[PDB]
Amino acid sequence: PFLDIQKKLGISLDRHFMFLSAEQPYKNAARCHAFEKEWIECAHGIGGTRAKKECKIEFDDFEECLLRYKTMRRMHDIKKQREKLMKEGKYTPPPHHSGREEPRP
Amino acid sequence: ISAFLKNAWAKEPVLVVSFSVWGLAIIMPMISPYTKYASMINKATPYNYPVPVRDDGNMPDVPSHPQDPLGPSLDWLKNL
Amino acid sequence: MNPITLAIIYFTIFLGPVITMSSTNLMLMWVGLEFSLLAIIPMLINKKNPRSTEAATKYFVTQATASMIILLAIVLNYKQLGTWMFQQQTNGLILNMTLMALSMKLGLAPFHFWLPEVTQGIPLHMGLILLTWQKIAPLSILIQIYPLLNSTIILMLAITSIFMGAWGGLNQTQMRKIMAYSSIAHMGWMLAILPYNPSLTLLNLMIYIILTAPMFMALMLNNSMTINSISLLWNKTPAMLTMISLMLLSLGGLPPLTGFLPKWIIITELMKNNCLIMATLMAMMALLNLFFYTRLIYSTSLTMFPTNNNSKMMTHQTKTKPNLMFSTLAIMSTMTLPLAPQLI
Amino acid sequence: KRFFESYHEVPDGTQCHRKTYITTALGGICGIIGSAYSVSLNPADSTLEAVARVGRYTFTAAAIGAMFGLTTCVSAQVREKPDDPLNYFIGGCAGGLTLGARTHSYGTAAMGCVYMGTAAALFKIGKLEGWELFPTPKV
Amino acid sequence: MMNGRPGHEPLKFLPDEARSLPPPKLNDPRLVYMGLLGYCTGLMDNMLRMRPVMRAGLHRQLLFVTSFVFAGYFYLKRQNYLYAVKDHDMFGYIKLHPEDFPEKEKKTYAEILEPFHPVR
Amino acid sequence: MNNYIFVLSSLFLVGCLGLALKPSPIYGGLGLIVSGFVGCLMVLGFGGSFLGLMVFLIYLGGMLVVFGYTTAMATEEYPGSNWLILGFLVLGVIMEVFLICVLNYYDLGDGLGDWLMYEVDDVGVMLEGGIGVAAMYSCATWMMVVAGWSLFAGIFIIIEITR
Amino acid sequence: IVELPTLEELKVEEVKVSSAVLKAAAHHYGAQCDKTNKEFMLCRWEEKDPRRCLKEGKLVNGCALNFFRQIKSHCAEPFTEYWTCLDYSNMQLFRHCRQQQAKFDQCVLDKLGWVRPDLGQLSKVTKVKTDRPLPENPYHSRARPEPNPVIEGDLKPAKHGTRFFFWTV
Amino acid sequence: IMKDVPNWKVGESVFHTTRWVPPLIGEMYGLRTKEEMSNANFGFTWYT
Amino acid sequence: MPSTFFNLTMAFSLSLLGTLMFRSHLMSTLLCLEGMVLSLFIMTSVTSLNSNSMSSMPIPITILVFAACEAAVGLALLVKVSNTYGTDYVQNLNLLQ
Amino acid sequence: MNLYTVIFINILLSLTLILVAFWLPQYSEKANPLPFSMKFFLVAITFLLFDLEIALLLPLPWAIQTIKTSTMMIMAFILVTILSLGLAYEWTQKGLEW
Ligand SMILES: CCCCCCCCCCCCCCCCCC(=O)OC[C@H](COP(=O)(O)OCCN)OC(=O)CCCCCCCCCCCCCCCCC
């Protein structure tokens, strides 16, 4: 950073734990460990100004591994559809909703 | 100095103990035959699953089977 | 102060900025800011005069809420990017918060009200630390994040500060507050070039430190918090009248002295980046700052104000000397201009 | 915001109505902000007194906004020359005069006229010459 | 700016690469200035402390003229490097990205026709 | 329910609105002690037994209690009827509903679905907060040292201020 | 459509025996049915996808049922008395059903030739040879961008010197 | 069922990697009985 | 969470409006100030918990430890004020004008 | 849940018992019934700077089982000690003294 007394001294008191893909205790990988990796091994050697346009696929994905919002919109839409159809009985609670269907190990 | 501890053991007989056990606990680990095992008995516990490595034939030690004579055998933790 | 306490505090006031600068995990940057807040408050109330408690209670509330806002920015980032640190992707509002917050701790522009008042109730000494070793920390955080901050806001806070600082200074007669106001102004120039060339911020700061540190140790040599008080400098200690004159004109941008370089290269960098609108208005009111600097010049040097008879008594007694730092920081400051190319 | 910008889109001197409306709003907005700072600091004595001050500042500012807009647009209309700093100066000239009146001072009108008009003229030039304000770092 | 450059020494003063550059001549006007800048600091000190201005602290005067100068050679040695890096960096880019910095042909005045505004 | 968290979140805002109307120094302390209870509960909802209880143990009874304590010693002069504040507070109680309402019709929404415990190992152990907080002693031993100095130099800062 | 195996495919005979009996016959289930279970893991951790190793999964669900099937014919009654006490606890400790353990181990030491492992002989990482081709580009990582080019050469005193304002330097 | 109106592609993974997104609790049981969502989302916290 | 994370954030803004709009007693402010630290602590803990990011749980607590002392300093200033004026009203803190 | 039920039942019992208390019964001036304890405040923030101490000492139960056991020991001892030295300073400061 402003004064890199850490790299110089070789110590790493503040770097080992800055991202979700850092070593998690007992090797319990966090959500998205896959993406963030893919989005920081990409932006390594390429500065930010160019980690912001071409390495946009990996952030657009990592922005949806963690926010997980585009999913919501899908699911929420699906939800509404069911509702309308169901009200007119167009759609019926699936066998799953009816339960059973052989819940298995 | 040695006879100053004698009133501090007669009167004030608390802080003596608190600075005699504060420390005792700093020297017991550095001088005990069994302090090595605490980072080892705590290192043996397989909390998560041991992922097996693919065989190449270039690995003699890696014990092929759970019951091979090879590998981390703890006849130590037993009767530690 | 039990010398032990003095050490713990001073260490914290010094570990405070240093952790901020060294760390990259923003969190660790926040606690560096937090320590500085905790360490400075004890020293501020050393006299424990009724004015002092007011000073600290203001400084603390202003510092504390800003600290909480900076933490909120870090907490929000943590959810927009798992990282604990600002990145290209950071939501713009996330960064703007950090600018406002950090511009409160540094006291720039529309948040410039606390500084003049705390500079008025603290001793001259703790005044220096509160003005110059407490600006290093927040600025570090900004300079690190410069690529990402907004050019518009900074400029507005920059211009505002320049104006507020200048206008405020014109009326003030208390020295501590004249300096507080100058610092607001210089702090403004510094934050103007941050988005464009951070390296110049670090020059417009050092020069400010090499200018203000001699200026304050001058104010306290005779411990004068009044211009009337500094005006009788000619009787109390005549030699410092010459350099006090040049350092104050150096603090303003007049060309032969070292003080021109920061303004000159900041203007050169802003014109290189095309802000010939902004740069022009800043330079113009920058000229207002020199007016109040020269008004003080008038009272202290160019004209000799009348003195009390007891001043002869203080002359008799040997005057405790000014530390060496005064000289080395007065000359390196009043005249290094011939060596500008290597400074930048 | 697509609104304020509209002021610039249509050629100057044309559609004065829109111009005056937009200019009046900006002044008024500034009025509110200005009154706010004026009330937050240097507070009033009674809520009503302060509501009044907000009104006073808002209207005065709205007025300077209107006359600026109206004068500049019309000056251009009557003069038929759309692109001319002078149009704006006359406008700024007028705007200052309104401020002067609201403050009941001929002198203020003096400084107001010159300073305000000059500023507005520079805005016109700025737009004509494509001057960039608050520019992004392009080094 | 120049930070983030490949190979950057994270906390070093002047990387050995700066050995390649010529050393600053000890009498470089600048170092000589720093000397005078220093002597003056010394003289000033004597003055503020009310001592015979020139005839006092003749040991200090030396510490000053010799501290400032010492500092200079090792600073200038660096600032010189920094500037030298700037060219290495600048010139290189001009080439690696040649098209963006294309050589231009300037028509002899014979060809170009700048208009003539008469003073009259 | 599924809106296990929302409801609570709403209660947390209510308590913060109470602290924001700046009610009498100790009547609002209660307010904090209420939303601290509420925030203690939410974290528990997500499985942070330790982190959660921690709040109920330190901020709740340690920090807050000491706060009111001092209120009693000073700044509990208990000289606007809080009832007026409760009146306003009630306004906000539903005024916030208004803020939510716009986005309510706009609608995530319909209470709270699977917007909690996103991913949990359906098998496995050692997955539990307090294993993470105990990284103060392995792989995150710098946060531990700096916290020490805070509290440690805290002693010296407080006494010096008090003296 | 994201590939999602047909439910029909997923159909496999299943263990369907409560956790208690699994916990009883586990240490023998680590001795036997290990080559068939580790290769699943060795696919599972290499090939990070449950839509590809389902092959070896059906094998695991197979060798296990094999394990018990022998125990059901061979030495079933003493096995029933073992987990029938072990499931009485609230955490199914071996610490209590320790007499039922040897009575089942000697019944299984004689018949079927099995010997229960020693203490630490299921925590070692065995090396399992398999044929599954190495899953390259796991994570389907789109090609990375190239590093910025490297200006090259040696430093030469700067050109014409600091090019500052009239500082001929 | 539930999807015969326009502009819908069944199984439209929202990511681009095509790697195995470990399904989220929500997507796994959500559209299923109100009981399942809790039993997955609150079964352990509620005890034993 | 996305929904809730909003409530906590507005809680912090409602606590923000509180500390930036004083009224009489200071102890109210300091109290409000603390309302933010709770909201920050809750939000930091919440996201860390649903990101399964255990490496970061240290922070939720470091935030509290620093915030507690911060408040300790704040209250000592407060006690200092109602020892010099004895009424702790932000109203009398105006000597510095 | 169960915990909810219990804690809630525990409340209802408490409330009822005060409900009955103010209603079963069914003027006379019957109702008719200070300086700062600086010492107290001190004691209070002494407790704040120590309660937080515990909060940083509660991880021990789960850190004892860390691989770097040697590290935990070291890290802990310092905390307990630096906090004892603080208390000790208070002692000398006589802050502890009432
Ligand atoms: C680029 C040019 C910039 C401008 C240069 C010229 C202006 C220099 C700055 C002057 C600023 C102060 C003006 C008013 C000074 C008043 C001094 C005074 O009142 O006299 C007392 C003072 C101290 O007295 P003391 O030395 O103790 O003994 C006498 C006791 N009555 O007596 C003294 O202070 C004596 C020492 C005074 C300082 C001597 C400075 C001589 C002039 C320096 C010129 C430098 C020119 C450089 C040109 C560069 C060209 C590139």
From Swiss-Prot, chain B:
One of its GO terms (cellular component) is respiratory chain complex I. It is found in: Mitochondrion inner membrane. Residues 55-80 are annotated as: Disordered. Its main location: mitochondrion. InterPro entries: NDUFA3 (IPR026626). It is a single-pass membrane protein. The keyword Acetylation applies. Keywords: Acetylation, Electron transport, Membrane, Mitochondrion, Mitochondrion inner membrane, Respiratory chain, Transmembrane, Transmembrane helix, Transport. The chain crosses the membrane at residues 15-35. GO terms for biological process: aerobic respiration; proton motive force-driven mitochondrial ATP synthesis. It comes from the Eukaryota. The keyword Cell membrane does not apply. Accessory subunit of the mitochondrial membrane respiratory chain NADH dehydrogenase (Complex I), that is believed not to be involved in catalysis. Complex I functions in the transfer of electrons from NADH to the respiratory chain. The immediate electron acceptor for the enzyme is believed to be ubiquinone. Complex I is composed of 45 different subunits. PANTHER family: NADH DEHYDROGENASE [UBIQUINONE] 1 ALPHA SUBCOMPLEX SUBUNIT 3 (PTHR15221:SF0). Belongs to the complex I NDUFA3 subunit family. This is NADH dehydrogenase [ubiquinone] 1 alpha subcomplex subunit 3.
UniProtKB/Swiss-Prot annotation, chain E:
GO terms for biological process: aerobic respiration; mitochondrial electron transport, NADH to ubiquinone; mitochondrial respiratory chain complex I assembly; negative regulation of non-canonical NF-kappaB signal transduction; negative regulation of reactive oxygen species biosynthetic process; positive regulation of ATP biosynthetic process; positive regulation of mitochondrial membrane potential; proton motive force-driven mitochondrial ATP synthesis. It holds the Pfam family NDUF_C2. The chain crosses the membrane at residues 57-76. It is found in: Mitochondrion inner membrane. The keyword Iron-sulfur does not apply. It comes from the Eukaryota. One of its GO terms (cellular component) is respiratory chain complex I. InterPro entries: NDUC2. The keyword Transmembrane applies. Keywords: Electron transport, Membrane, Mitochondrion, Mitochondrion inner membrane, Respiratory chain, Transmembrane, Transmembrane helix, Transport. It is a single-pass membrane protein. Its main location: mitochondrion. Accessory subunit of the mitochondrial membrane respiratory chain NADH dehydrogenase (Complex I), that is believed not to be involved in catalysis but required for the complex assembly. Complex I functions in the transfer of electrons from NADH to the respiratory chain. The immediate electron acceptor for the enzyme is believed to be ubiquinone. Complex I is composed of 45 different subunits. Interacts with TMEM242. Belongs to the complex I NDUFC2 subunit family. This is NADH dehydrogenase [ubiquinone] 1 subunit C2. The lineage of its organism: Eukaryota, Metazoa, Chordata, Craniata, Vertebrata.
Swiss-Prot record, chain F:
The chain crosses the membrane at residues 1-21, 38-58, 83-103, 139-159. Its EC number is 7.1.1.2. It holds the Pfam family Oxidored_q3. It is found in: Mitochondrion inner membrane. Keywords: Electron transport, Membrane, Mitochondrion, Mitochondrion inner membrane, NAD, Respiratory chain, Translocase, Transmembrane, Transmembrane helix, Transport, Ubiquinone. Its main location: mitochondrion. InterPro entries: ComplexI_Subunit6 (IPR050269), NADH_UbQ/plastoQ_OxRdtase_su6 (IPR001457), Nuo/plastoQ_OxRdtase_6_NuoJ (IPR042106). GO terms for molecular function: NADH dehydrogenase (ubiquinone) activity. It catalyses: a ubiquinone + NADH + 5 H(+)(in) = a ubiquinol + NAD(+) + 4 H(+)(out). GO terms for biological process: aerobic respiration; mitochondrial electron transport, NADH to ubiquinone; mitochondrial respiratory chain complex I assembly; proton motive force-driven mitochondrial ATP synthesis; response to cocaine; response to hydrogen peroxide; response to nicotine. It is a multi-pass membrane protein. One of its GO terms (cellular component) is respiratory chain complex I. It comes from the Eukaryota. Core subunit of respiratory chain NADH dehydrogenase (Complex I) which is composed of 45 different subunits. Belongs to the complex I subunit 6 family. Core subunit of the mitochondrial membrane respiratory chain NADH dehydrogenase (Complex I) which catalyzes electron transfer from NADH through the respiratory chain, using ubiquinone as an electron acceptor. Essential for the catalytic activity and assembly of complex I. It comes from Mus musculus (Mouse).
Swiss-Prot record, chain J:
It is found in: Mitochondrion inner membrane. The chain crosses the membrane at residues 3-23, 40-60, 71-91. It holds the Pfam family Oxidored_q4. Keywords: Electron transport, Membrane, Mitochondrion, Mitochondrion inner membrane, NAD, Respiratory chain, Translocase, Transmembrane, Transmembrane helix, Transport, Ubiquinone. It comes from the Eukaryota. GO terms for cellular component: mitochondrial inner membrane; mitochondrion; respiratory chain complex I. Its main location: mitochondrion. The keyword Metal-binding does not apply. GO terms for biological process: aerobic respiration; cellular response to glucocorticoid stimulus; mitochondrial electron transport, NADH to ubiquinone; proton motive force-driven mitochondrial ATP synthesis; response to light intensity; response to oxidative stress. Its EC number is 7.1.1.2. It catalyses: a ubiquinone + NADH + 5 H(+)(in) = a ubiquinol + NAD(+) + 4 H(+)(out). It is an enzyme of class 7 (translocase). One of its GO terms (molecular function) is NADH dehydrogenase (ubiquinone) activity. It is a multi-pass membrane protein. Core subunit of the mitochondrial membrane respiratory chain NADH dehydrogenase (Complex I) which catalyzes electron transfer from NADH through the respiratory chain, using ubiquinone as an electron acceptor. Essential for the catalytic activity of complex I. Belongs to the complex I subunit 3 family. Core subunit of respiratory chain NADH dehydrogenase (Complex I) which is composed of 45 different subunits. Interacts with TMEM186. Interacts with TMEM242. This is NADH-ubiquinone oxidoreductase chain 3. It comes from Mus musculus (Mouse). The gene is mt-Nd3.
